Design a protein around this ligand. Sequence first.
Ligand SMILES: Cc1ncc(C[n+]2csc(CCOP(=O)(O)OP(=O)(O)O)c2C)c(N)n1
Ligand SMILES: Cc1ncc(C[n+]2csc(CCOP(=O)(O)OP(=O)(O)O)c2C)c(N)n1
Ligand SMILES: Cc1ncc(C[n+]2csc(CCOP(=O)(O)OP(=O)(O)O)c2C)c(N)n1
Ligand SMILES: [Mg+2]
Ligand SMILES: [Mg+2]
Ligand SMILES: [Mg+2]
Ligand code: NI
Lengths: 565, 565, 565
Amino acid sequence: SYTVGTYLAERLVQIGLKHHFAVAGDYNLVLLDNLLLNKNMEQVYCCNELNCGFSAEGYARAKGAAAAVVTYSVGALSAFDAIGGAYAENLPVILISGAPNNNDHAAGHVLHHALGKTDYHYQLEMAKNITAAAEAIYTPEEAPAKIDHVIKTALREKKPVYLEIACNIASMPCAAPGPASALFNDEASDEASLNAAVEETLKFIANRDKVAVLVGSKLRAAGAEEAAVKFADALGGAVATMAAAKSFFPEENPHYIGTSWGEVSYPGVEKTMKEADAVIALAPVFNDYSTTGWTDIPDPKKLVLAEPRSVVVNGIRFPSVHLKDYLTRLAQKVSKKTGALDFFKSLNAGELKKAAPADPSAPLVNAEIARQVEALLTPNTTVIAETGDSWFNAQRMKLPNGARVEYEMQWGHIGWSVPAAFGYAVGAPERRNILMVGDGSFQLTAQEVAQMVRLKLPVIIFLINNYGYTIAVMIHDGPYNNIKNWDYAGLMEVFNGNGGYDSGAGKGLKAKTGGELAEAIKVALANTDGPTLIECFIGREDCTEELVKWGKRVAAANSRKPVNK
Amino acid sequence: SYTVGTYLAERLVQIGLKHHFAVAGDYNLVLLDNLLLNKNMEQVYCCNELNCGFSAEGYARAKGAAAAVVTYSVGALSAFDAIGGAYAENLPVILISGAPNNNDHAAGHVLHHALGKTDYHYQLEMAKNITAAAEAIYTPEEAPAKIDHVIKTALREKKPVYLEIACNIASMPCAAPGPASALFNDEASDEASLNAAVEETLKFIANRDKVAVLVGSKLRAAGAEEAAVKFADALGGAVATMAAAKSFFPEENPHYIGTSWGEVSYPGVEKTMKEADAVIALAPVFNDYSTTGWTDIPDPKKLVLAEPRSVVVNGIRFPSVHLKDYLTRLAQKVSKKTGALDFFKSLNAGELKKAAPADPSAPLVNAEIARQVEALLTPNTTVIAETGDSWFNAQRMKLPNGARVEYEMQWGHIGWSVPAAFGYAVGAPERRNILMVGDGSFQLTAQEVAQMVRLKLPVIIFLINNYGYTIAVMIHDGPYNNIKNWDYAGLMEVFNGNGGYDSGAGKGLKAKTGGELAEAIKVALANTDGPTLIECFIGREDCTEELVKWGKRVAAANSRKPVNK
Amino acid sequence: SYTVGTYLAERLVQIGLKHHFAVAGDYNLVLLDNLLLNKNMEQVYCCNELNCGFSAEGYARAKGAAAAVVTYSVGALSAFDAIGGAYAENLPVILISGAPNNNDHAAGHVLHHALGKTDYHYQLEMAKNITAAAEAIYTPEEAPAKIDHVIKTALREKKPVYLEIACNIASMPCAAPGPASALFNDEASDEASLNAAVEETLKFIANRDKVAVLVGSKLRAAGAEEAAVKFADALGGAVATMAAAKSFFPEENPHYIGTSWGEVSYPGVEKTMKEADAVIALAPVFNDYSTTGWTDIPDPKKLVLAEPRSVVVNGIRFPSVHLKDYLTRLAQKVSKKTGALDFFKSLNAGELKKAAPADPSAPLVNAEIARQVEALLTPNTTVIAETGDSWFNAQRMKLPNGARVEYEMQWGHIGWSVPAAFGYAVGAPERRNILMVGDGSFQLTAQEVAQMVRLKLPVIIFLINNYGYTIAVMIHDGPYNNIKNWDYAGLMEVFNGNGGYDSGAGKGLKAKTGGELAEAIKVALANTDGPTLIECFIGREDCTEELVKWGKRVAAANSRKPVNK
Ligand SMILES: Cc1ncc(C[n+]2csc(CCOP(=O)(O)OP(=O)(O)O)c2C)c(N)n1
Ligand SMILES: Cc1ncc(C[n+]2csc(CCOP(=O)(O)OP(=O)(O)O)c2C)c(N)n1
Ligand SMILES: Cc1ncc(C[n+]2csc(CCOP(=O)(O)OP(=O)(O)O)c2C)c(N)n1
Ligand SMILES: [Mg+2]
Ligand SMILES: [Mg+2]
Ligand SMILES: [Mg+2]
Ligand code: NI
């Protein structure tokens, strides 16, 4: 039969989870015990609750959904930062929090781990601000509906949700869960709306032969990646990805012209976007970063805006239309509109200029690092790129079909990448998992590398030691951009603890030249029993020219003076 | 003149801050530039925002107030956890957050670091649940009043507060601040009430010779420690401390009888408390941990409750009576009530039983560690004691007058002790600052030690490596109590980074015998240029006797089934 | 083309509104101008915002949805009470509030009608607590998505929603709305779940022969009234209505046995429910009133709980199964379960005892009022029954098929009935609309009768003048149950204002005997050009027997002492 804990466990298993992440606390131990009863799913422990949140976030990037289990108050509050991130990056992370004994409610009881008042709903009220659904379970009878509600909502909305469970009811009997299919049940497109949206689009591009497609960072959340490819092949138009949509469209496809990102776009892309008479944006996010300081905004008179669940085209809004249906039907009706792609080719702007192989003995530079990492890409590779110049190194890489890049470009939490890489590697252990992270970001969440060691995850970490917050240096410089330098390579043996209670097979290596990097990479690819950190030493001013151009824009936008109102 | 930024800086300097803590972000960079302009204060940088909040918390325990500065969303949300802790521990920490350009407001703008919607009041709305005041500054004209409001509230209520500042107004001119005294202005005790409360207190104990005094954990926040010593000397009664009130009363005062903590009370203290005719609780916090699972609750018909700003005595409640004034006035009128103390001493229940110095060559045991640590205790010494068995090692120690213990027993966030020690040492560098932390807790926030090395703080760290969450093992045991063991001593040289971009003078030593421990403690004292981590190895089962007894009652309280209603 | 305002009006028209209700204020004037441009809809003006909210609520009962427009703060806050009522009664009311000029945002601007602070999100934040969706529109670009989102949520959830619109963008251009069918697009039942829930129900009642069906008060919201009689006819079991579900099932269907309401159930009904071995609860709301002070809770070991969007049966919970689809499939496969119906008939409990026609010249008594009112009931009739003895008067009436009763038994706001009857009459002017209201309730919202006069609505108002709050006198008597008597009949000539600026055709009559009432009812049916209020005079202690029995049990529940720990 079922308890509150094993009901939740079963639902998690039904939406496809093979792992859930947890930090033990006295308010969730019984719950953890009940989750553990389901041998179809593994309990993975993290160091702190922030890393736990980002671990699940990364896991959801690999498997589509995730779960994090923390304790009441002291656990959940730091996790909220990760949950906020999951929301911003449209990932269904289910955050489960232990909660006080339900006898301690409306009793006038001060409780440990809480604020010192007799109020026990402040955590729920906080969570409401950063989740698609949030529920507290204080009795077993209400458990099944609340669990089903939040899990259904997360999958439908592609947003994180919140659950708290009284510690003394986690083992209480409750109803059994029905079929898994009920959890994914969602409304189909309104047929009439779907047909009118497609027809309006054909009317719009009837005498606009220069059609460009702009791939956006919500395309995976809409499950519309495959459909985008059918539509593009049918259209024969020019296809560019927004920066945060890297790898959301096959780069070996003949219609792909590269990255669209204002003045830091691939060669010929900015001109082509300007020359197109119609722009079809598939699930874009336009914010201050993606529009390069509000300098690159799509011409509203040319824009066909196709969101996950609605289309605006030809001055008409069509709610209740799923992007994948709209793309699939459109791909069946559309004729060739090659004008944009023909214009792009007529530019002869050439491929992205990339640096030649560096002299192996010469001092290591950022370009030489990017070159060697790119050479590691395969159809089975995933690169995790941290906020920082790593954003731009990654954007410059040509991806073979199948290879993935993971960005956190809406939330932008430095340190996200380390736990996110951990969780991703747990979720997709069969892939070659590469983490590109700067020294500054790495310090926020570095202990999660020890969990990589613990689970023998062969993550390859390229640690860019440029000695400071360089991306911040290119926005606005000051003494707050300086940090304490670590011996990052030596940190691996610390996490191994060889000679201690347990063991580890992680390796840490330093690279000061192109030759030393190449040797380290060879060692990394041979390490199958643990992660390999490659500490790369480069100058502080040595970064992509993209970062410098983009940095000026961002700084000017942020700092622009108030307008009288 | 003054700007929004330099206005804030001046107010912080006026309330006695000599440092503030910060994590740079593109929404607070200009704010940070302005704070720097005031050289009467130093800007201290932290690894992540959680740590930064706890550093401010620790700093507040040393200086009486503190400030932390983070960036919007990604910074603030994780720091909320520390702020909640400051609320629970009655510490005026001022959290200042950068916020979006004020032109981005109601403009329909999606921004980096936000949830992907177009509204920016969720952070503030969350903040309101865990602060005594929360204000957003969107224009220069509003800044002074809002800054003054939150700071006055923080100091008066002894609670943390929240301020956010639009990033494009930090350098905007505003009014100059007035005299610092205005920030400490607080109401006096209502004279009529003060007198009535004291009189009612005299009537209540007129025929109750066995009066016992219970020192609670809000005593310092009430600024009433000195007045308690005066009242006690006048009463000549028996004085015991609650667990969290350790060092809030002089332990070599002839009226001090030890710790009152249910069945884990000092010898005879429990009997003396149950034998008393009248218990005078000074600023007590009665939660589930402090009452040992609701087993040791004060007798309601013996209790005089003297909270920080009110007194309940003899069935009458007297608001607007400051604890400090109450005790001082009471000290002038009270007569001798020695019965409880007389009863205590007759019991012949000897002093706390401590083990004799172990064989310096034999394997290290918990008792021995606590022995040498106690021998380091000095009137100049502060012990920061982490959640876990460190709580009880510290509770068992006799403190010379002047010696301080710092507990986070209401919030009980593990990992707190590391950044807290950092911030405390920054705020009290002349003191001998000792940190007693478990291996499990250390892993959550270990990177902040790197900041101890950076500022050359001679903190002495006793890391108790028993390989896991032993305290949780004594509440409810499971696989979630196990962790990845590190080489913690080796971590120090990683943080030093000698041979890298910079240097550090921290030391990492291992201690496995009572003898190895003794030599390490010598090396640690000899190290004045940085922190010293002493990794002590002991078994998992090797904990204090108190932890086990106490843990069972706590586990029982948390697990008790519901009652029909 | 469309403005923010005309976009809203078209969507309201599309979901089936022929009227919207409004109160003018300087923050919604231009919005009201834009709504008026759509001729397919009339704009109806109310006295105050509370009544305007309750008129929309009534309208929604008649037409399935409604909209109310009010001004910022002073209008909205009062209307929030009505909106909470719509949430409680599962009625999709759309509350649209004017809001400040969008230039006044984050400008440090104090505005009339607001709290005197400089921030303007408190009204939204409040609204979130009592709606299924709540959006603020500050720019014309975001309007269509937000308007579409709140309306679709309201229709899907059957709950009220909230919209505010900046007063200076109501005339601003925006996209055009797509096809109306988009707004009703909902998910279908999960086929595997639907079939599994059908089977589990069949297995559960395999040898549970005495099957009873309990019609609950959310059956209309679930759109499942028709599917309920299909199921009922197939099963051949006994069907009882919960008090609040009166008229949600055909009372001359051969399976109907009457009201199930504890010790005030119809004769035989209570014994039938106890005797049954299976109870099929259809969309029930079990609260303290419907369970008669928790004295009548359905046996959990025999309950099939079929909610609007889920089913719990045989220990298994089936989300994603619509009640309509569930009952329809069930009717196709279920076999005869007559046992409970056989049991009911064998009881020979007889019909509900009803008084014979009194002597016309004798003093009026409650039963005679209910008799004559019952005699007016027709297939074209709707009774609006106010909180108080009217509840039980209406509950006792036999309804011809077609006749409806409207209750507000979840929210229970006295005074609801007057505005509610107004909106209902506006939305169903063809029907015989009868309002049964106590003198106590009438005084709260009496002015809305003047609007009945204004639109010439032939509402028949029975005003039970027993001089006070009789229902509360039976709960717990005190001086707070006495009121100031009015001349309720003469109030009609006041609202007519004949001889003034306009005219009115309302009539007010007094009835002190059975015959006087008979005579007044005839002139009421004659009056086609306006409402007719009949002021009936009865004693304070002259109420239904059910009221006292029910009242005692309710007062017991609410006053019961607290539980220990
Ligand atoms: C939690 C959090 N705190 C602060 C920031 C602000 N921030 C953005 S980039 C950055 C610097 C990143 O440093 P590093 O990892 O060294 O990147 P790189 O030097 O390669 O640019 C900072 C502090 C953030 N994005 N998230
Ligand atoms: C953030 C947070 N997560 C979980 C807990 C619950 N908790 C209390 S003590 C503890 C174990 C502490 O481990 P350690 O530092 O090794 O203490 P020791 O084993 O010496 O008792 C945990 C997980 C907590 N207090 N705070
Ligand atoms: C706004 C509001 N205030 C108070 C109540 C509580 N209440 C319930 S019944 C009642 C008295 C109703 O008086 P009346 O309409 O004369 O009913 P009757 O005497 O006919 O039973 C009151 C005050 C309520 N339901 N709603
Ligand atoms: Mg860096
Ligand atoms: Mg431990
Ligand atoms: Mg009455
Ligand atoms: Ni605003």
